[PDB]
Design a protein around this ligand. Sequence first.
Ligand code: CLA
Ligand SMILES: CCC1=C(C)/C(=C/C2=NC(=C\c3[nH]c(/C=C4\NC(=O)[C@H](C)[C@H]4CC)c(C)c3CCC(=O)O)/C(CCC(=O)O)=C2C)NC1=O
Ligand SMILES: CCC1=C(C)/C(=C/C2=NC(=C\c3[nH]c(/C=C4\NC(=O)[C@H](C)[C@H]4CC)c(C)c3CCC(=O)O)/C(CCC(=O)O)=C2C)NC1=O
Ligand SMILES: CCC1=C(C)/C(=C/C2=NC(=C\c3[nH]c(/C=C4\NC(=O)[C@H](C)[C@H]4CC)c(C)c3CCC(=O)O)/C(CCC(=O)O)=C2C)NC1=O
Ligand SMILES: CCC1=C(C)/C(=C/C2=NC(=C\c3[nH]c(/C=C4\NC(=O)[C@H](C)[C@H]4CC)c(C)c3CCC(=O)O)/C(CCC(=O)O)=C2C)NC1=O
Ligand SMILES: CCC1=C(C)/C(=C/C2=NC(=C\c3[nH]c(/C=C4\NC(=O)[C@H](C)[C@H]4CC)c(C)c3CCC(=O)O)/C(CCC(=O)O)=C2C)NC1=O
Ligand SMILES: CCC1=C(C)/C(=C/C2=NC(=C\c3[nH]c(/C=C4\NC(=O)[C@H](C)[C@H]4CC)c(C)c3CCC(=O)O)/C(CCC(=O)O)=C2C)NC1=O
Ligand SMILES: CCC1=C(C)/C(=C/C2=NC(=C\c3[nH]c(/C=C4\NC(=O)[C@H](C)[C@H]4CC)c(C)c3CCC(=O)O)/C(CCC(=O)O)=C2C)NC1=O
Ligand SMILES: CCC1=C(C)/C(=C/C2=NC(=C\c3[nH]c(/C=C4\NC(=O)[C@H](C)[C@H]4CC)c(C)c3CCC(=O)O)/C(CCC(=O)O)=C2C)NC1=O
Lengths: 173, 160, 32, 160, 160, 92, 54, 161, 161, 280
Amino acid sequence: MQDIITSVINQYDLSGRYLDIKGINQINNYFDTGLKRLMIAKLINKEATNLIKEASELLFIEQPELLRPCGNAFIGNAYTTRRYAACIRDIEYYLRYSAYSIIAGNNSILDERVLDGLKETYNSLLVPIGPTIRVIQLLKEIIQKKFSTENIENAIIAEPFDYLAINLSDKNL
Amino acid sequence: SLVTQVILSADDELRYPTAGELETISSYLKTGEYRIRLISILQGKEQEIIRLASKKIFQLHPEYIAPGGNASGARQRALCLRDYGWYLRLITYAILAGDKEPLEKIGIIGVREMYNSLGVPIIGMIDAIKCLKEATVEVISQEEEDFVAPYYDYIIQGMS
Amino acid sequence: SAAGRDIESTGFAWWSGNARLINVSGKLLGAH
Amino acid sequence: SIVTKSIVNADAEARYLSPGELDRIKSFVLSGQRRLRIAQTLTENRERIVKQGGQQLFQRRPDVVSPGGNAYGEEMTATCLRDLDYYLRLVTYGIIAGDVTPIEEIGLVGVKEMYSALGTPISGVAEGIRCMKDVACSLLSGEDAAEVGFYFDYTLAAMQ
Amino acid sequence: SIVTKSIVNADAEARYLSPGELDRIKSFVLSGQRRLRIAQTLTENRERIVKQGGQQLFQRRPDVVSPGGNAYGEEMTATCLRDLDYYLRLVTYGIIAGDVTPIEEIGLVGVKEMYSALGTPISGVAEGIRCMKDVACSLLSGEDAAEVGFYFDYTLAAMQ
Amino acid sequence: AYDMDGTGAGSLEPRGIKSSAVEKDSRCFKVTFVLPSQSRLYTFRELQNVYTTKMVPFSSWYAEQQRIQKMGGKILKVELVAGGQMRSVGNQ
Amino acid sequence: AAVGNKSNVDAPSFKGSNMELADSGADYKAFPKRRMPGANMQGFLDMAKGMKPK
Amino acid sequence: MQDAITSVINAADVQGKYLDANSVEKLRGYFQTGELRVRAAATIAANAATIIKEAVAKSLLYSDITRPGGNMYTTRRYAACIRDLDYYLRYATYGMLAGDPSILDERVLNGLKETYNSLGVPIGATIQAIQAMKEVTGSLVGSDAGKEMGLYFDYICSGLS
Amino acid sequence: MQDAITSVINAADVQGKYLDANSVEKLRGYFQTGELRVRAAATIAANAATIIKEAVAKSLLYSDITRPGGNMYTTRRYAACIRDLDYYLRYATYGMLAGDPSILDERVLNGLKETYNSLGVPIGATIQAIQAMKEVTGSLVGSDAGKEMGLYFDYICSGLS
Amino acid sequence: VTKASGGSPVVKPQLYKTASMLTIAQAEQQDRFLELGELNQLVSFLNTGNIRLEIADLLTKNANIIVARAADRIFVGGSAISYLERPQASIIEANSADIASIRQMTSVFQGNNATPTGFKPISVVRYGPSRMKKSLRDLDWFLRYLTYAIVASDPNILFVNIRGLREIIENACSSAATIVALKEMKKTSLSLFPENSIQKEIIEEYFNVVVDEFINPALTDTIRKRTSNDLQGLRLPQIYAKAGISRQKFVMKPGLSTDEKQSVISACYRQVFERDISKA
Ligand code: CLA
Ligand SMILES: CCC1=C(C)/C(=C/C2=NC(=C\c3[nH]c(/C=C4\NC(=O)[C@H](C)[C@H]4CC)c(C)c3CCC(=O)O)/C(CCC(=O)O)=C2C)NC1=O
Ligand SMILES: CCC1=C(C)/C(=C/C2=NC(=C\c3[nH]c(/C=C4\NC(=O)[C@H](C)[C@H]4CC)c(C)c3CCC(=O)O)/C(CCC(=O)O)=C2C)NC1=O
Ligand SMILES: CCC1=C(C)/C(=C/C2=NC(=C\c3[nH]c(/C=C4\NC(=O)[C@H](C)[C@H]4CC)c(C)c3CCC(=O)O)/C(CCC(=O)O)=C2C)NC1=O
Ligand SMILES: CCC1=C(C)/C(=C/C2=NC(=C\c3[nH]c(/C=C4\NC(=O)[C@H](C)[C@H]4CC)c(C)c3CCC(=O)O)/C(CCC(=O)O)=C2C)NC1=O
Ligand SMILES: CCC1=C(C)/C(=C/C2=NC(=C\c3[nH]c(/C=C4\NC(=O)[C@H](C)[C@H]4CC)c(C)c3CCC(=O)O)/C(CCC(=O)O)=C2C)NC1=O
Ligand SMILES: CCC1=C(C)/C(=C/C2=NC(=C\c3[nH]c(/C=C4\NC(=O)[C@H](C)[C@H]4CC)c(C)c3CCC(=O)O)/C(CCC(=O)O)=C2C)NC1=O
Ligand SMILES: CCC1=C(C)/C(=C/C2=NC(=C\c3[nH]c(/C=C4\NC(=O)[C@H](C)[C@H]4CC)c(C)c3CCC(=O)O)/C(CCC(=O)O)=C2C)NC1=O
Ligand SMILES: CCC1=C(C)/C(=C/C2=NC(=C\c3[nH]c(/C=C4\NC(=O)[C@H](C)[C@H]4CC)c(C)c3CCC(=O)O)/C(CCC(=O)O)=C2C)NC1=O
């Protein structure tokens, strides 16, 4: 992976030049929000086991089909508790790697460890991609409930969850 | 501790500690006594805190106290405060050696199978630690309780 | 579930151990 | 949208965007405040725009809901209104994108193959969208009804 | 036996025995009365089963007993029948064990190395066991001859 | 070939176990040790005996002895059963 | 019984109904013949009752 | 790894003789108890976790091996116990079905007492746990079945001593 | 990897309904042939080497794949055949017991024809070996049992084609 | 966006075992025809056969009676059995089993003891419909995998889907309101058979596998910690790995029988060379 810093330094190494001030201004924008990026992360560790629970009920309250028999399409939704146990486990990962990626200030950790082969894996097990992405942003609204009076923490929290949404899409447009 | 993690993590690569790691030891040792000053604050409030933990773990969960529950009876409740005492004692270790291993080599690794063979509901113990963290905020000011806050919720993350 | 038949399950001792039925309405109806 | 195909137009021609293309991206983004208000009206009127949309559709095409019609019974009639909720949604996309490009590659390209392959009368679903158009333009002023109705009749044109 | 390898199967898999394994240990021990009767028939018929066994073996393979054959003379022919008494004994073990596990690790594992290293035609000793099989199954009913013959042909299979 | 080509720090293959074993070495130890897994309580795999006594070669005793202590093992006894001592030529 | 009696005209087949017994319904396809309205869709079924009677 | 039938066949085979009246006499004795052993192994499979929970609470639950410094203090160390006691109750079930304790020393006993001395596991508390586990096992399977399952517990306790 | 009971349970489960009369109707049909399949799998286990020896000698023993240049010339290549034919006679035995050819394409058919094209193994001679192997298998197990075991041979031959 | 792709082969995850199933797989994994012990394994469960099957239909036919008699015990508020919804997939049909519950428009007691002590039964009107839309659905399902375990070989499919189940629904359910309902199905299902006949002991043993294991702590999640940096740690419910054939291992304890020492060594050949060349 690469944080915002190492990604910035590779940006200037490829061109083989020292760090100018436009390069350093990008680093300073991380160092300013870096102290704010932690209690976002620290709130997630304190709210982790909860925030998955509100995401699941908010998901199945709109997708009751996911708790039902699959139809003859052998599809992996949360039908059985074996299916339900593993299916809650995926929400663990989406909250986790989107928690590191809040601290790195860059989605490099996301795609190489979550996105690479994600459509591969779900197409094998026939897993829902639609509801799978919707639960990713149910977490985003749920996390943004805590930091809401101001609006500069909101763009920070949105960046990891928004990146998984745009990338797991089969592109309609 | 933290130096032990650097010696170990540098030892499996067969190299001396790098520039960043020696920061991680140097910055940890410069914040030394403040953990030492903090643990003496908590040791003087162990009878403080576990009395407050038994406040809300049982008003939240009268299932365990009632006749039939695991904690019913005097001697069952007697060790009940002892488990709080060992956990609070473990957290003073974790607050000092600035990482999670004393909370992980003890207490966390294999805790569910310990409780499941005891009859203690593992979900109830999660609220017990969450109750214990709720109790530590009152006898501690705002400066230093967020220093000790991340050591508590690691235990909750470890127990799930 | 079941609740309140001890000293440190309600706070009241045995000589007050008829007043563990204040917040327990089902046993209190069978008490009357 | 107007931004993406004004680009891919000038993209193919090996050139940048003319004033005719850049004075309209400019003119479109200043129009963006008024577009979100129009789409905001149709967003939380889907209960009436769809249900009254299927109102006139069955009064004008009782065959499709009569026994033997494609949308017969409690089941198909629910899906009978589901498609109208789809096409009403795509019109909200076209209003915000300033073009039928969202409506083009969703619900229009190859639509006759789907509905012919589902046994649905494609002329019947065209009648449904026209009934939604009179309900939609009745909810807005004249300056807006020349837009919201404007995207429906394009969907009417491509749907036959 | 069926008891020991149904165990070591479930032993390796870190699990207990399924109903499929325990309804067959159950089914085998109720079969144990009938197995001892079958082995009791072959036990005191070894005089005829072996001597008539070597009867057809020499009529079908006169080379092995002719001058130059491996079992030539008064000496080798006695040992020529000794091996048939061995393999007839192991079949009595397999019938009582309900498996060729006794026949497997005795007289079958590495049998080609022995007989190749003794100069004996391994195909010839396979012909001897087949001649014993027709004598053995001629001594029992059809329900039994599907077992006693069943263990011989396994020995025939592994012996080539 | 052998494990001492010139590799040390700052070299392309990663810094790792470097044994002083010659070309096709024929020396082997007889070691004895216990090695508790220290990882079964979050993996829940089946259990295997940890007290083993086996012949490890000289070509890879150092890696094994360096690893047995990596996971907290204790080495009770080792010997050089096969091979000579101070032997310039002949370890091959 | 066939009852082929006479005057087997062709035109004018009329109406009414009878719904004769199935068979062979004793075979065994593993999948149903599919139908709708899952959940994600209870909203619109209840809601197409609204216009059902019109 | 021999059962009663394997051990009978081995001794009758090792002398090169057939299964005479004495060899089949013991085999008939094993088939008579075949019905008892399965039901004994049936209930033990059902109450595996309950038996181990009863033994540790009855023998070594509150002793000071359980308290700090004792041999069973940390949760990894406590969890290793019920994992460890599961094998004794499991392998004893195998000996009860096979009717021969050969599987125990083959797969449990060898290198066992030599391993506990390495770790420093108290052999004294271990045997009393198995003795208490033997006591509850006689509760479930009955008297004679408990006599059978109990006959392999003390075999473990004897060799582990 | 599903048998007839697994496939019946899957289709009845995939619609979320219980095992109605039609699902149990096929299950009763499978239990009726349960006695036939075991005896079919019994004799095939006994005459495994004899069946493969009969098939190769009857189909491709003396053809010029056997001679130099043919696809089966060297002893490693000849030995790979009877190893290879053993799987077809073995996995077909599994399909005959399970009553469902799901195990074949799961463990045999997938990547098989794509593998023989890589090695250059003649698919034409392979199917005729299996056809001849199917012919001898109907000799042993009888007519209807041969119809059952034969029903999975041509399934291999069809997909391998 | 991902700029590469490994492909997605069709994979059917394991769901359960059956007695007809795993023994076909055990000798399969050892690369052998099943032997006469295992051929004797596959036969007499097929010989169980119609006995297993008839237990389904007699249990399946009065499925409503099995479910309703639990509804009388632990659900206040009249019938409260309307929220049943047997077809749970929204299909038109292919075919349906027959149940045929209440006909005309708790009848006789004489032994009926459900709640062991002062257990509060759920109300219904206060319990709300949406939560009520599961409780009859799960009292349904406990009738189901039991009638899939009878029709299958083992109770294994119950064990996978009932292990952590009570924990997951523990917050929206009083757990003791399940143990009462699950012990009403065996008391109802034992009304069907002449007891001390063979079928009476079969289905009884399958009920106490699900109800006693229902009151049982959930398995702990298995963790896969990685050794070096570039790997990533995973985590799997222990439910997930105990469903299916569950591939076996081989160990070389010196002192085994020389076959099981031979089956393990030849098992080592197939692992490293992919084909037992000593056999080949
Ligand atoms: C309808 C009347 C009524 C009711 C329901 C209650 C209810 C209650 N009172 Mg109360 N009380 C009452 C009248 C009542 N009181 C009267 C009339 C007085 C004045 C005497 C009191 C004085 C009083 C005190 C001082 C206390 C209570 C307490 C309590 C609570 C627990 C009771 C207990 O554990 O006693 C258990 C019973 C006993 C220990 C037995 C006492 C026996 C007495 C001393 C002898 C009675 C003599 C009698 C006339 C003849 C007996 C015959 C003899 C031969 C045996 C409970 C809520 C306690 C409380 O605050 O809890 C919240 C408390 O501390 N009450
Ligand atoms: C770190 C990034 C990452 C992810 C996300 C990941 C997912 C992942 N999800 C899996 C299964 C699964 N996932 C689900 C999930 C769902 N079912 C539904 O109906 C819902 C849409 C959804 C829950 C939101 C189910 C049911 C299975 C099991 C499929 C089956 O066996 O039937 C499996 C196979 C089991 C295993 O873990 O070994 C993997 C690997 N792996 C990764 O490395
Ligand atoms: C250092 C880490 C560590 C812990 C935590 C530990 C716990 C532990 N808890 C135990 C029992 C117990 N623990 C409880 C606990 C409780 N009841 C409740 O309602 C509560 C939520 C909870 C206490 C806060 C009960 C009721 C028992 C007795 C169960 C019985 O034996 O019947 C036992 C059996 C012996 C004993 O009490 O000492 C151990 C070993 N051991 C360790 O080494
Ligand atoms: C976003 C663009 C878009 C559209 C439009 C769309 C349509 C669509 N319409 C369907 C069914 C259907 N559609 C109808 C529709 C009608 N019956 C009538 O009488 C009327 C004329 C008409 C509605 C106004 C009926 C009856 C079915 C069910 C047909 C069947 O069950 O065989 C189905 C199959 C079931 C489903 O998955 O919903 C699809 C995919 N999908 C899309 O992605
Ligand atoms: C229980 C399993 C088992 C077997 C089978 C076995 C065989 C065995 N066969 C032997 C010899 C022999 N075996 C034969 C056998 C034959 N000659 C023929 O023509 C026939 C084809 C064939 C017999 C049907 C002959 C001729 C010798 C003596 C060879 C010599 O003297 O060089 C010997 C050496 C002498 C002795 O110790 O008996 C052994 C050990 N040992 C075992 O433990
Ligand atoms: C981390 C703790 C640790 C140590 C210390 C260790 C030592 C160790 N030293 C070795 C050899 C050796 N060590 C020496 C050392 C010396 N010769 C002298 O004259 C000097 C006195 C001395 C240098 C100070 C030599 C020459 C060999 C090679 C011996 C041979 O080829 O026979 C070997 C044999 C294998 C190999 O080198 O690849 C090991 C395993 N292993 C460990 O895990
Ligand atoms: C199948 C035959 C067999 C047995 C029996 C066996 C035992 C065995 N017990 C072990 C540990 C252990 N065993 C215990 C057991 C106890 N502590 C007590 O106070 C009690 C007396 C006792 C429980 C009855 C403990 C606490 C450990 C952990 C020791 C440590 O972490 O240092 C270990 C170390 C590795 C591990 O557990 O992962 C092994 C290999 N291995 C086998 O293959
Ligand atoms: C279980 C499902 C399954 C099958 C079927 C399978 C086949 C398979 N057949 C192979 C080779 C082979 N297969 C043959 C077979 C034949 N030559 C002929 O002329 C005949 C038409 C045919 C015999 C019927 C030969 C000669 C080779 C060796 C090819 C070579 O050395 O280039 C090889 C290469 C590796 C090896 O044999 O060790 C594989 C992997 N693998 C599987 O996992
Ligand atoms: C075939 C074996 C099997 C069962 C039974 C099973 C149950 C199961 N019950 C669930 C929930 C639930 N189950 C119930 C109720 C109850 N459950 C009971 O066993 C009681 C009869 C009743 C309480 C008295 C309720 C109220 C919920 C919703 C809980 C929630 O909102 O999270 C869920 C989560 C999805 C859902 O909302 O339905 C599963 C997966 N899964 C299985 O694989």
